[PDB]
Amino acid sequence: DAARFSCPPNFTAKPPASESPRFSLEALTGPDTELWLIQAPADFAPECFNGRHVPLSGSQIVKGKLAGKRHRYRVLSSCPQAGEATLLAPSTEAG
Amino acid sequence: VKPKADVKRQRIIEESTHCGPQAVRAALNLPEAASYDEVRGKWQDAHLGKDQRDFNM
Amino acid sequence: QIELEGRRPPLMASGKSLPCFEPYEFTPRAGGFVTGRFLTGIKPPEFFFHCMAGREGL
Amino acid sequence: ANTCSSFQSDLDFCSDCGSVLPLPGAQDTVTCIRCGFNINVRDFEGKVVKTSVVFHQLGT
Amino acid sequence: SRWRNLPSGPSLKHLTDPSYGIPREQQKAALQELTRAHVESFNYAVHEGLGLAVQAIPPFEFAFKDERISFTILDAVISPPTVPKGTICKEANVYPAECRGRRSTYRGKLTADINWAVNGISKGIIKQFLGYVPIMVKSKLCNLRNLPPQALIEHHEEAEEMGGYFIINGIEKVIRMLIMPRRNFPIAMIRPKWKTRGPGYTQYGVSMHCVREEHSAVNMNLHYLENGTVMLNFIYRKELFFLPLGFALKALVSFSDYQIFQELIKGKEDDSFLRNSVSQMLRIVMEEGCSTQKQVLNYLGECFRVKLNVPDWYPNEQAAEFLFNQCICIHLKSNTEKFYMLCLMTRKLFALAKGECMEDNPDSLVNQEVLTPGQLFLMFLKEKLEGWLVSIKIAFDKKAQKTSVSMNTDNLMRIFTMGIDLTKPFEYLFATGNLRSKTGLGLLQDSGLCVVADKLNFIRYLSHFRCVHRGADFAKMRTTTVRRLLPESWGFLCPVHTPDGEPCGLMNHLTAVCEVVTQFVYTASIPALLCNLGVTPIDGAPHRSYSECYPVLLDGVMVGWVDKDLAPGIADSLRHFKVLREKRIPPWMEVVLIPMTGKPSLYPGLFLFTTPCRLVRPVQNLALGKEELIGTMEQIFMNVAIFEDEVFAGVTTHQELFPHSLLSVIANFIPFSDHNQSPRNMYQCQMGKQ
Amino acid sequence: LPSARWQYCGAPDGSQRAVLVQFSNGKLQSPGNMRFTLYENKDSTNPRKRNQRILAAETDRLSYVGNNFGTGALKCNTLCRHFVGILNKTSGQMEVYDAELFNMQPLFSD
Amino acid sequence: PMMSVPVLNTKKALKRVKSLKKQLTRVCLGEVLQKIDVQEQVYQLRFQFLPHAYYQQEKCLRPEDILRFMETRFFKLLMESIKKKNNKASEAMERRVQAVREIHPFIDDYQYDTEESLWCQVTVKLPLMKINFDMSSLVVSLAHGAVIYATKGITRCLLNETTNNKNEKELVLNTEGINLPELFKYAEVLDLRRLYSNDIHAIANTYGIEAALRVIEKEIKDVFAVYGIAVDPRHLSLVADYMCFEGVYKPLNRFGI
RNA sequence: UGCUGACU
DNA sequence: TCGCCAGAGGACAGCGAGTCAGCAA
DNA sequence: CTGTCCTCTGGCGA
């Protein structure tokens, strides 16, 4: 017998989102869709890059504006390394 | 020391400031010339070596 | 020419003999060759190398 | 799952050394698989080419 | 700055000035910065460090009759000196002018408020009077603080004095900065007398000297055994105990054996003797009986319970935590951080063993730090407070073991029964100089800790607050290699100022511009800034191969793995912050980046020290002209011109403030020292003090 | 060099988060047979507890558990932030979302 | 330790000495090797020896002798060390291979190199349970202290061409080891009278004690000479006569009393 | 008696 | 088949003279 | 620190 994870009494299972068709497995497996993992400093404001052209290879300095102050962010793009975080998505197939 | 004798001393001291590369190189038995950075690397290797008798050379 | 253990002054762990000298510097000055005399004193690095040798003696 | 030849893969700790044919189920969670691995672990390694050698060092 | 307004040529029109005898409005400020390391250390030791010391102080629970009693020390406070009790009249204060006339100690009152409980529902806060602790002269717990030179003359004082000393029986003991290995940094060492520690030990090992908040120090050694296995030696109460690694790693972290392994093979994931030796550490001694964190803690608890002297009603799992808290990596609060630090020290022994790294000389100032008067004072205070608790409750358990219900009537009569202790023990360390402690305080020396400061001259006196003693044990050694004046003490120790007989090379003196760090800062926003700069947290996704990455450390805590092409820019950015006082980088953080090549150079990685006992020295930062402060280890990877016209474009990152910065304070009083031979400047320094 | 136009469609209230998993013992050879269940704390009034989550993964042989709180919560979840970018190759537009990273670990009880 | 025998001053002796110097220097397996290639319980090993261009010049070695050495000494010291570890752990190619595996039960087959030691490997296997680690460590710590052949006690010779101005024609075969009898075979190449060594215990065993007295005296004199000091011979005579009083070279220390 | 300094 | 050539570590014992002072146990 | 002195210490043919 596998001791089956037992959920603590103060926790409840979160249902899937049927109102989420975006992170749906179907949407993510589309031939024109690519998934990217992004790591940033804790104080990084992603909105500062809105409309700006982030690189898909190499290293580039990208300028962002936050609260009126100009910030410049070095962006490094790479080939996924074996062992990287896997994205979980709701699947109708998985009940 | 007499002047006209410290001028020769000064010129010899000026000449002595150019005798390191040749000395070290011709002691590592490196190509006689054409290497100016291989010599620094060979000296570094001889310095971090374990035996340390190519450094005393 | 300063000589401590029968050898020139020792290098640091980074390859420089003294904070003033580039690492692995070829000039004899960087190895303890003092061209100054007590008539006209010896610059600050030569004073340090000379001090290592006088202390080795004591 | 992608852990090699000394761990449990599913679990976490490291298995014991081989004696009987079956993968030696660990003291915890004794599940077994791959009694004897397909290929013996082959290792490609050699020595250095400056001191031990009189070759590779004619000049340089 | 602090070296501006330095005279350009001497003058003689200051004597023969109409104001020669008028006492000045404020004290000199250049003479004050000499004993500054002795006073700013004590100021912390007695106010901000004492609270932290008492905060550790595990509550001393023990059994009375069939009852269990808990005693905790909530606060301890040292008061300025004062007339004993009120039995005296007309002036409560007590100024150091007396106790020199009389022959007595300038001692302040140390009192704490203990809190005793019976199971935690019955409690009362009593305020016991612990004893008397000596006080430094201008130390914030002294009566001569904040006095101008004119008011310092009506009390019979020097009008130019900087105390930095103690008056133990009117003798002015001058406890001097001893040399310690380092703090919170793993030093890889090749000592051949280590293979005698056991059957298969080798002459390789990384030592770490751990200090927590300046109140606790501990020394832990990771040894390499010939099998490829690593052992851990810890010392508790002067006894050496050897625990295989794996027992320690499994206890500290509830992680799988493969995850512990994936960590100790981070940079050498192709090597196969290592991969095989890591597995032998995890399986050979741990799959032999204990495979869950608790069983490891339980086994470790049973073997060590007898010599850790733990409470009898303690589960073995609780006795294990006691060992890890009090003996291994004192500096780190977390057990997860303590795991990552033991893993980097091992990853380093594997590189020293395979000859991929150079042994760190313990005798280079790169791998050395100083022990100030406040670290010795607090580290003795804390130990004596723990001893006081133990003795009061020895008396407790021994008196009657009798129905504490009504015995709450004599509880104070009980605590006072052993509160008669803390005074004389403290004066021994100061009047005699030698240390009587159950744990030697992570020190290695037990004598010559405090010395008489004699005012034969003001050049004998000023040299007691700038002396640095390599150690008192090295005065007895056949080999003379701790007497070599290496080129790494450039600007930090004077070449000329050394005693010229039996103490030669062992008693050094700081240059005029050198200084000890003594401030304590937050250093909490630094780990979050390093990540903005380009570091990737120890948790994962390095973005490269763990071999083309630098292991980032910040005061014992491994932030982790700045990429190899981002390490230079990160070091330069951090150096620009400290110089311009941006972010919260302390003006004195040492950003070190030991580069990595294929050669057996010192182990690579970006360190960042900000601890309170390192030596620093000013240098004019070129390219900014902003008077940076560099440390003993940070100075080995940078070019520092002395004279201008010696500055170059790519070379000469920095420049020195004055050309005579290298020489001590006394060696700067010798005229034309450049034209005399050096053994003569060493005798002049010793003759100007007689 | 190939580039993408950055857009943070992100989370409407920031209540929405994606879910990233990392296994402490390596890569799962067959992630297709795993069932993941995300658990959240019932206490929505306590700001400290309202963000506590447990991720459980069940296989035939073992269970994995990851949490964003307590010892199992690791430093990377805060010092750094994680995002997921969804790139439309045709439009060159990258949509960026907040992500939560769970470090997964095996399940056993005495 | 050292020696110094003059060279006999004859045309034949001068020619034979070159070979003599090249004959007494130690050649060790490690001084002749390029790099090993270890594969691993079936542990193979290819030695890949150096070409003769740059080591036969001053070592007097030949490849058949060197390889024969591996078959008879290294490949069995290897099993000796494997047992050292495993005791406390818990047409013509054919005859050579056959005799070699006649003597050991682990090896299978090596190789042959009919062209200047092209590829010379070996294969072993311990099939049941052995500690499979990077045994390259053992076969490298052993391929250093493994010496092809050396005169016992002599580590290197050298001919310091000139030692005299009066009769400049002198040649000396100095050595950095000490084996007196292993030079007695060259009484026609070298002058065995005039043989000198700084050992004083070896002289006292090959020539007697009255010959060690003078070596003691000359050693003390040459020690003082490097500093210009000069103690009178009448003092060293008494010291050497007292030290060698009772037939043996006795130390002047706590065990001599 | 010991620890700290100190002299040639 | 264990005696003696070899072979290992462990233990001990030495570490220049002679002076002057103070402080403290 | 380094040296001898000392005490074992199990290992192949006679």
Residue numbers in the entry:
A (entry chain N): 8 to 102
B (entry chain A): 804 to 860
C (entry chain A): 918 to 975
D (entry chain I): 7 to 66
E (entry chain B): 5 to 694
F (entry chain M): 6 to 115
G (entry chain A): 1262 to 1301, 1313 to 1362, 1496 to 1662
Paper text:
Eukaryotic RNA polymerase I (Pol I) transcribes ribosomal DNA and generates RNA for ribosome synthesis. The hPol I consists of 13 subunits and the yeast Pol I (yPol I) has similar counterparts with an additional yeast-specific subunit, A14. Here we determined the structures of the human Pol I in the pre-translocation, post-translocation, and backtracked states at near-atomic resolution. The overall hPol I EC structures reveal a more closed DNA-binding clamp and a flexible one-subunit stalk.
The ECpost structure reveals characteristic DNA–RNA hybrid and catalytic center in the post-translocation state. The “metal A” magnesium cation is coordinated by three highly conserved aspartate residues (D592, D590, D588) of RPA1 and binds 3′ end of the growing RNA transcript. The nucleotides are mainly stabilized by subunits RPA1, RPA2, and RPABC1, and most of the nucleotide-binding residues are conserved across species. The cryo-EM map of Pol I ECpost reveals a rigid globular core formed by ten core subunits. The two Pol I-specific large subunits, RPA1 and RPA2, create the central DNA-binding cleft and are surrounded by the rest of subunits. The RPAC1 and RPAC2, two shared subunits of Pol I/III, interact with each other and pack against the wall of Pol I. The TFIIS-like subunit RPA12 has an N-terminal zinc ribbon (N-ribbon), which packs against the dimerization domain of TFIIF-like PAF53/PAF49 heterodimer and the lobe of RPA2. We performed glutaraldehyde crosslinking to prepare ECpost followed by structure determination, generating improved cryo-EM density around RPA43, PAF53, and PAF49. The C-ribbon of RPA12 was not observed in the ECpre and showed very weak density in the ECpost. As a result, the clamp in hPol I is positioned closer (by ~4 Å) to the DNA than that in yPol I, generating a more closed DNA entry cleft. Positively-charged residues K197, R1663, R1659, R418, K423, K424, and R429 of the clamp are brought into close contact with the phosphate groups of both template and nontemplate strands and may stabilize the EC during transcription elongation.
